[model samples]
Structures are given as C-alpha cells and as structure tokens.
Target chain A: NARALERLELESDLRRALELGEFVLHYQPQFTGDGRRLTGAEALLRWQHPRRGLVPPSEFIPVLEEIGLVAQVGDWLLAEACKQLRSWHKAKVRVPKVSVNLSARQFADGQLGERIAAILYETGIPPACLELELTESILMSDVAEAMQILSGLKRLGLAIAVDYSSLNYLKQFPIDVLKIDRSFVDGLPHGEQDAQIARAIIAMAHSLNLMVIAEGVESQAQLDFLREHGCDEVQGYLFGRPMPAEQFGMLYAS
Target chain B: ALERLELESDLRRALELGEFVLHYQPQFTGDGRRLTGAEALLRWQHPRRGLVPPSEFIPVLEEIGLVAQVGDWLLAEACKQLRSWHKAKVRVPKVSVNLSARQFADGQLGERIAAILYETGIPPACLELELTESILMSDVAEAMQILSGLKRLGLAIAVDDFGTGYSSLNYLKQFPIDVLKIDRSFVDGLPHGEQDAQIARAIIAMAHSLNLMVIAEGVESQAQLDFLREHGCDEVQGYLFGRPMPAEQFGMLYA
Candidate 1:
C-alpha cells in the first residue's frame, strides 16, 4: 500500500529536515501586564524542505506525529528553544523565560522528564528559564503518573503550563496558568456560555495563584473583558498575526 | 533476576559497540571571557532509542558496576577529541570530565588516567577530572592518595557543585584542585536580591582566601555575568558561551 510509501516519505522528509537542517524557529514576544516588559517569548516552528517551500508546523506537525517524527520534531523544538534562550542571554538581551509545546506522543514516550532536564543542563539554560506547555488532556490521563512527571520536572527547575484549552482548567489539577481557549476570547461577552466558563476558569486559576491568558482576541471588547476580570496575558491574530521573528520584534517596538 | 544481569550485559555491550561519545561544553574566564576549559560529557547512543543522555542512565552505571569501563571510555574519548581538535588546528583548551565517587575511590583510576594520557598523547596539564564533594568528604585519605597520583599525572581537580556540600572550606583545604564552581542554586539569584549578591561575593572571597580559582556556573545574563566579574570571581561555565555540543557544532565558537 502507498501508506508505507507515505510513512517512508514522512520519515525521509523529517530526517532530511533534521540533517539538511533548514528548520528555523520564530519567536513571538509576550509582554507583561503593562505591555512594556518582555516576560517571555513563545517558540513556534517553521520548516523548509527541498520540495516544499516555507511549511508551517500546522501543515506538517500532524504527519510528523503520526510517523513518530514528533519525537525528533519535539527534540529540535526543545533544543532550538534552549539554544535561542542561551543566545539571547549571551547577547545581553535580558530575555525572559521561554515557553515550548510538548505533544501527546512525546508525553507518552516518557522521555520528556529526562530529556528536558538533560537538555537544560547541557544548554546551560537556568533550570528556571524553561516553561513547558501542555494540553488539558495531559492532566486528565493517568492523573498520578502525570503528577509524578510534573513533580519531577518541577524538581529539575522547570515551569509547567496548560495552554489553549476551555476544558475546565481548574478541575484539571495543578496547573500554573489557565489559558482560555481562543474560542472563548473570540466569542467574548456575546458568547454567553464561553463568557461564563471563561470567568469561572479565571476565578479558579486566580484562586490558586495561577495566571490566565486569553487567546483569539482581536477587539477592544475582548481586551476589556480580559482586563475587567483580571486576566494576566493575551495573544492572538490581533497581536500581530504570529509573524516571523523580525516582524514580531517590530510588533513589540510599536 | 534476568533483568539485573541484562543491565550489566548491556553496559558492556555498549562499550564494545562504541556507543559512548563525548560532548564538549566550554568554560570561560570570568572577566576575561576567554575560552579556558571544556567539560567532557559522556553520551550513549542506544541501538533503538538513539541518543540517550547521561541523566537517563548515569545512575545505572554505578549500580551495574560499569563506571570503570565507561569512565575509561570517557577519559580516552576526551583525549581522542582533544587530539582531533588539536589536529584541526582548533584552539582547544583545558578539558574537565566528571568522575563518579566509586571510580574516584578506586585505586586503579590514577594509573588508568596516566595510561590514557600516554596512549592518546593529550597533554596532562590540559586535562581536569571533577569529583563531587560527597566523594571527597567520604574518605579523604584515600581520595587524597588518588588525587596525589592524579596530580603527578599533571591532572587538575575541581570540586563540582561547590556551595551545597557540607564543610565547604574543609573540602577546599583537603583537596589539591584548580577551580571552584559556584553551584547553580546560588547563581540562580544574581541581580535579583542582596542576599544572593552577598553570599556569592562571600564565596568568591573564600576561594581567594584558599588561593583557588572560583567559577560561576549557570550564568544566564549579562547582569549575572557582570555581577560575578565585578565580585572578582575567576571563571564561569554556562550558556553565555554555548551549550554542550559535539565537535562539529562547538567548532563555530573557535571559528
């Protein structure tokens, strides 16, 4: 079946991307409460292959995961992140900590805890300079094991977060931040259901001292709602449409 | 039962199959910011799992009694890497590799290191072996004997994680070493608090008191770097230079 061919092509493309090494990371700046202090930047992946020109993670990531290329991709993302953070520190940038995503395949493999710790050690990134982003599903599955992994990662001096989910972030357990799914932001005061859930989640997270971030925001209303309720941070298409590093850097300047 | 023996078998097999490789991480002079030394990190490439890091299996090295075999591999690997880098006309500097407690306590380590230096022909003055405080604290007399022999081989010693260990000055006085690495926990606070600043400054003065070079590990910012250098610390190893890298990647720093 051509399925084998597809997997081969996927593996070949991934390995070549790693070896030919055309993968580059784009850093989007996240500002602190006053929008002046650069708290941290989020790392988003982009790829270029001999055949495909300028592929975004959204296009290739699903395939990257299905073929077990997620591990390789995830490793690159982490190392590249560590590298960039280190580079920023060296340049006298006073860079804030970085946030990186970890996929389900990567989570289940159980190499994450050690891989992250060793990478931080090797990269010379202060254990405190890394923040790992997970999904709501992570807390739901195998609660005890997840807690153990979370605890171990914390012990190694890393921060853990759950981003981009409306799935009852509080009942989910031990989260550092309640990132309101973009839908909640887009739907805002108009979407009564989303507004209620968003408020409750924000309340729950705030009650525990975890920060709250609202995504998918584009209007003054969304921003105001977040402000009114004391949501901590926001990012979206309105926040400059996720541009390349240079453009994103300019966004911060403006 | 079977699993226990299998672990030993795997470690031996790993050595036989040439699964051990060295990653060189650079260290710098605190204020001068010059390439002064590199730590040789041991990495394992499992046949299936690909590159497995030390954090994944270093503990097993002790339980399975493979420290000697793997330790020699690392020492030789450093010699080989240094020789190769030197051949390439790369500005290779001092190299430090962490030696486990059991291996340092072993009598054969001194001679084994000497033999490697002779075999690979890397100069002994450029080779440094790091021993943690617990090991030096455990059996000072034996540790000192092995350390004396190592010094005769022209090897330098460093106390890893310099602050957290109990009897800090005691370890510094007992061992003949080159540099003291300020533990990461202390470095994690520079430019943030007076307490951190005071303790770090105190440690630097203490190292100077003993006439030992002091290095700040985990220095992540110019503020942190400037803070340490202003305090008169001697050396630093952290991302400011580069991460632990293979021979090819780390060459860019020299280039």
Candidate 2:
C-alpha cells in the first residue's frame, strides 16, 4: 500500500503541477566538435515543486508517461522551446537552433507533423532552427508509421535525429543526425571497444553525410577522441550542464 | 491515479478470475510447409475492455508479482490444450510456451513444469520452452542449471529473439540450447535490406554450425520466406503463416 499510495500522490501532484505551470525548460548547450562555438541547445524538462524545490525528470517523467500526459506535456515542451529560440533570435543571440526530445507517445500521434508545423508557425521560428530528437527504440517500434511521420517532417524543412542504431534504417530514413548514445561516450578514450565504436559511428555517419553528435562527453580526452574521429557535434558537462533558459541565453547569447 | 491502480487491481483479479487465455500461432518446417508446432502466446480477456494486449498488462503483472503465477498457469493451460487437441486427433506435433525471466527465477519451476506435464499426460519432448537471450544472460550460472534440469526432463529449449541480445557465440556453445528464434527486427527488412539480410544469413549459418535449429519469426511476405528458405532457415512463423488465435480457432484452422 505504501508504494501504491506514493504513486497515487505523485500522479495527482503531477496533474496539479501541469495546470499550475510548475514545469520549466532548461537548455543544455550543444557545441561544435572543436568545442569553440555553440551550435545549438537541447531543451530539457524540469519540474519545479513548491516544497521539493526541483524534481528530476527521472523521478516523475515515467509517471507522466504512465498517466498518459506525456503527449500533452510534450506539446507544451515543443512550443516553449521554439518560443524561447525565437526570443533569442529576436535579441540577436548566437543560439542558432534548438533540439527537443520527442517521446514515443508524441511521435506516434497521427497529427504530429501538423502540430509541430503549427507550433513553428505560431512561434515564428524557422523550421531549420528546430530539430526533433527520437530515440532508436521509438523509431523501431513501428517502422512504417515512423517513416511516414519522418518524411512529412523532413519535407517541412525540420531536421530529424535519432540515437544511434541499425545502419539499414538510417539509409532508409531521411535522418539528418545520429546522436552517439551516452553509454558509448562514457567509455571513450580508454575503453578500447567504446573508442572503436565511436570511430566507426563517426566514419559511417560521415559516409552517409549524416552529422554525428556525441552525448555525455564530460572529459577532455572524450572530447578529443570525438573531435579526432570527426564527430560533428558534442554535448555534455564538458560543454555545459542544462540550465534555466534565461541563464543559458545570458551565458551563450552574443 | 485511476489508470495505474485500476490496471494493477484488474491484473490482480485477472488471475483469480481466470481471465487469461493462450493463443496458438502455428510454426512450420522450412520449405516442406508441414505444421511442426505452435507457440503459446498469452492474452487477457478483460471483461470490460474486450481484449487487453499483453504489452499493456504484462508489465503490470510483473510489477505486482503475478507474472510467475500467470506464467505457471499459461504453461499448464497450453499443455492442457495441446493434450485436448491430440485427444481430438489433431495433427499438432508440439507446443512452445514462452518463459519469462520471473518464471525462470522460480526455484521450483522445473518441478512445477514436470507436475503439469504429468497431469496433462503430454510428453516432455512435445513441450518446447522458449527463453530470450536477456533472461538467460541475467544469471548465467542459474540459467545453466535450470536449462540443464529442463533438458533432463526431455523438453526442448529455444533461445527466443535470437540476435537482439548480447549473447556471444562462446555462451551459445556452452548453453544446452536446441533452437534459435531469429528476432522479428532482422526479418522485418529481409530480402531487400542488405544489412538485415546479411545479419539473418549470418545467424542461420552460425546457428546451423553450432548444430542448432534456426526458426525465423515475423515473416510477412513471400520474398522474406524465400530468403529464409534459401538461407536454410529450419522453420518459419509469422502473420504470413497465421496470426495467433484461440486454441479452438487454431485447431479449426490447422489441426
């Protein structure tokens, strides 16, 4: 009963939070492989609890998914990220683009393409300035549906990215970027297998003319390895941790 | 609140209320087109929901610790159905039941399976227990002992969803396995997808070299089957063959 009660309380609180505007977006800066220039930012969700102060996504994101609210929240997330990018552009900030992660539920929506297009239109953000990130597992869940959605998005001028996976699907889809999973980056420069995989992924992605972005890069050695192997973009603590949108704009805005 | 609790409570009541059922999907031998056996898949007949997909409820069953019980019931129920089919002079040669990781962790799983086989009067050789590579890899030592015990019972063992998990060729050699189920992902791109085709071919060659039978799942087109048949894939099962249906419907169609 304790576990069940906790879950119930959490679900109710999440619903309240959503209605009260207690959720906020944090932008993590993504940099070029050289680590000298900011390429873009990834919008990450954060829940601001009145008493708890700040709640980590891992603590409540799954509950939102289970409660069937992720799609609704994801819509807000996409709009908010786009609006922020537009604001930064209005101020002549250096922020070139923003990437938002799409949950499986959001991606599966039949009107996902239409919804995103409407958001971009309303926010006055160029489609090329927005990137949609989908996990490899989500795309694999329903390949045919994913292909249709991806093709529509690609035609709309937005870049589509997926966390690394099977090369066959990569060639088939209009994928623009491959995010090297954090797990592979965690072992870079030292783990022989990880280094080899990182190189191979970079090589293969370049061969297909798809940009490769390595995530979870926290060390100089990791950054160096990725850069040497021709990883186009890098994201993680080495560049900057996710922060409030205002703080990110202040730090990186030109 | 309503969703999680309702689903959890419904799953709890499901077993007690006997709301679960087994659907049989017939598998066939490669090239011969002969019905070899059927895989027993679980379904929940929710009174209000019509039919609840396993993907939605199976995780809840695992969370609430009801999976082992449901798993045991599925084994017994599948065996009972197979026995009834045989009694009716149906041509079902064998039956395969998927074993969850939770069920494998049950210390008395072997004894419980033996009891069911004995009660149903189904020969051990006619029952094939399918285990995913992840389940087997969870604890190599324990899985080895359990697999050996099951093999000793004269039942067949299959590594379900073969190429998806991180099982090395070395582990495959060490384990006493009989069948390798080529995962649907590999088959989904077959005949046309060169990478998938290569991986599927490699798996078939590797499995055969290890003296194990390879069965490809999710074969939906003639081209896919042709590729598998050409590669010497031992058996095939997918929507192209037949969708999973109730024992009665399965018998009517194939038996």
Best by TM-score: 1
Candidate DockQ scores, in order: 0.02, 0.01
Q: How displaced is residue B21 in candidate 2, in Å?
A: 0.9
* lDDT minimum window of 10 residues, candidate 1 chain A: A245-254
Please tell me which predicted candidate would have the highest lDDT against the true structure: 2
Tell me the TM-score of each prediction against the true structure.
Answer: 0.51, 0.50
Give the candidate number with the greatest DockQ.
1
Clashing pairs in 2: none
RMSD of 2: 21.4
Off by over 4 Å in 2: A1-254, B162-167
Worst 10 residues of 2 chain B by lDDT: B161-170
lDDT of 2 by residue, A36-97 (tens): 45789999889999988888799889999998999899989999999999999997776889
